[PDB]
Amino acid sequence: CYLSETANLGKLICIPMALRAAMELNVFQLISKFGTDAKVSASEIASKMPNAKNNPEAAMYLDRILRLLGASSILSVSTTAASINDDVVVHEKLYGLTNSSCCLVPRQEDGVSLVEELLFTSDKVVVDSFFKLKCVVEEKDSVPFEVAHGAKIFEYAATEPRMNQVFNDGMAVFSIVVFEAVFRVYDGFLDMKELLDVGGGIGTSVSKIVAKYPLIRGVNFDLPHVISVAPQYPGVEHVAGDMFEEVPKGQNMLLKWVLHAWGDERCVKLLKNCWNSLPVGGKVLIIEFVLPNELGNNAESFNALIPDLLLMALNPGGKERTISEYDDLGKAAGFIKTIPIPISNGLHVIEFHK
Template identity: 40%
Template sequence: MDAKEDDAMLRGQVAIWHCMFGFADTMALTCAVELGIANIIRSHGQPVTLHQIGASIDGTSSPDIPSLERIMRLLVRREIFAAHQPSNGGDTLYGLTYSSRWLVTESGSESNLAPLVIMQNHPLLLAPWHYLSQYVKEGRSSTPFKKAHGMEIWEMASKDPMFNKLFNDAMACNSKNGMQAIMAGYKDRFGLIGSLVDVGGGIGVVIATIVKANPHIQGINFDLPHVVATAPAYPGVEHVGGSMFESVPTADAIILKHVLHDWGDEECVKILKNCKKAIPEKQGKLIIVEVVLQPEGKGPLDDIAAVFDLMMFQLGGKERTEVEWKNLLVDGGFPRYNIIKIPTLLSIIEAYPK
């Protein structure tokens, strides 16, 4: 091999190493969230030393500083945290970056991903990844999650209160993220809606945000009974328990945010048909907030969207291209649609029954 091919082979090997040990990034990130490192740095109001971080970690009086240093070294390389050596030659100081600001959970922090980090890296959510090859061989007889645990994630949440809280906290966090872009990208259209149902709305974060900004809207948060049972009260929002596979409360419009990607095409068509029955035939509208895959896209959001698709794969769901969304909507009774792009991973899809 010549020097050019040697270099290419080395880069190929490094790429495999990165994939092979990608879990180290995941676990280091989870460790940082569990230790509350972003909160500790934020509470000091300035970059801090490892010893200052260690002294502020809850639940221990003698943290292992050398181990903490090695974890932070990797997270600094990944630009989750920043580190710099002070000019006076003192200990290295660690600060927040735009990435670690998403891990701050202090009061007043509207945008944070910490609960989602904890849920996605919980042993119950990690186990299904070991069943991907088996799922490919055996087909869609059972999802990787069910192969790992003997039940689907929704059943697990209904039977295990601790997992239900973990799941609801993560979904509430997920619901908040992107809402600013959604509200800005759709604000003029909310004025024409008198009543709105959030189907699969979890504990009501999305509909509460919409109603707060548009108090003329009568909001209904619709989800499974065990989910809405833990939902807080919001002005102008009614919580309704039920199954979207059976029926949906009636309203002028329906919003589905990060719901349809949880399900295969057959289940989605059933949900869409129930949504169609619940809105006016002429003026009714369906607002879908989901990823629209761009298979040929080269940007960072396109890369994350591909990861999201594989994540949904283990639960029996999928992310979809525009063509796949079009086919799904037509099958579900919504022949007209319009895609509104917003500055986030998600897009807004308006769909109409006529």
């Protein structure tokens, strides 16, 4: 009935915004610091937030966020015999991490988690674009990001240093997670002497490849406003330019999370520029979440549908593709011998050979 559906539909905006608040308050990491199988109260978590130390009401407000995440199975909820054991009312339940929220705890060794990518995809710049999503259906050649912000996303990033940082860091940390999965399955880097990352962001991806395979000379290529903020990484040379004008010569190339932002004509133009800059026997690796041939209720399907909706909002022509669709782009640009390599939950390496 209506008053069942109010709950099912009304919670949809609330959960991500509660999650974003919890990530910004570092709730998950604070719970993790209490140890294995920790179950802690809002009051205990708030005690570890210096910014809350003069706010008597902080724990009660925090509990209102955490109990929604508990109801949603992002946190586990429990109590104790000591709390149970008639005229006193215990409001505070105890919260613990779940499989999903463990992925929101920065790793002790290097700080990696899904936090940075999830903070990008719920950033105000992205949500403001989503408020204009209907324009793609109504208006020929409209792009929601352009309707919201008056510029395309990569042009906007060159004017807006906060957005540039959020986007660049979201891609970079997510890249680390993805390459850990790639290196467990894929052995195609072992024989390479040089790798050029085309649209490589701040260079994190090629830094990790060179760290794993130290005979590889790494080159990172991106737009001027990205290269200007890129760190110095061991074994990585940075190159600024425009991949639709000219790609540097390299023995092998990587395109990770690049083709999915662009329509077919732009993708063929870029792939022809890569072909022109590769030697005979070179290859370009495409790393993307591949759209399954039949969608279902599984991680592989959602791993493609999420960026499919984001790129529809964020850039003209951007979309997720099937293996067949990627093969067609490579073949149009002159490549032969397409080799799709499943990695994990829809993530693939697709090799295009010159």
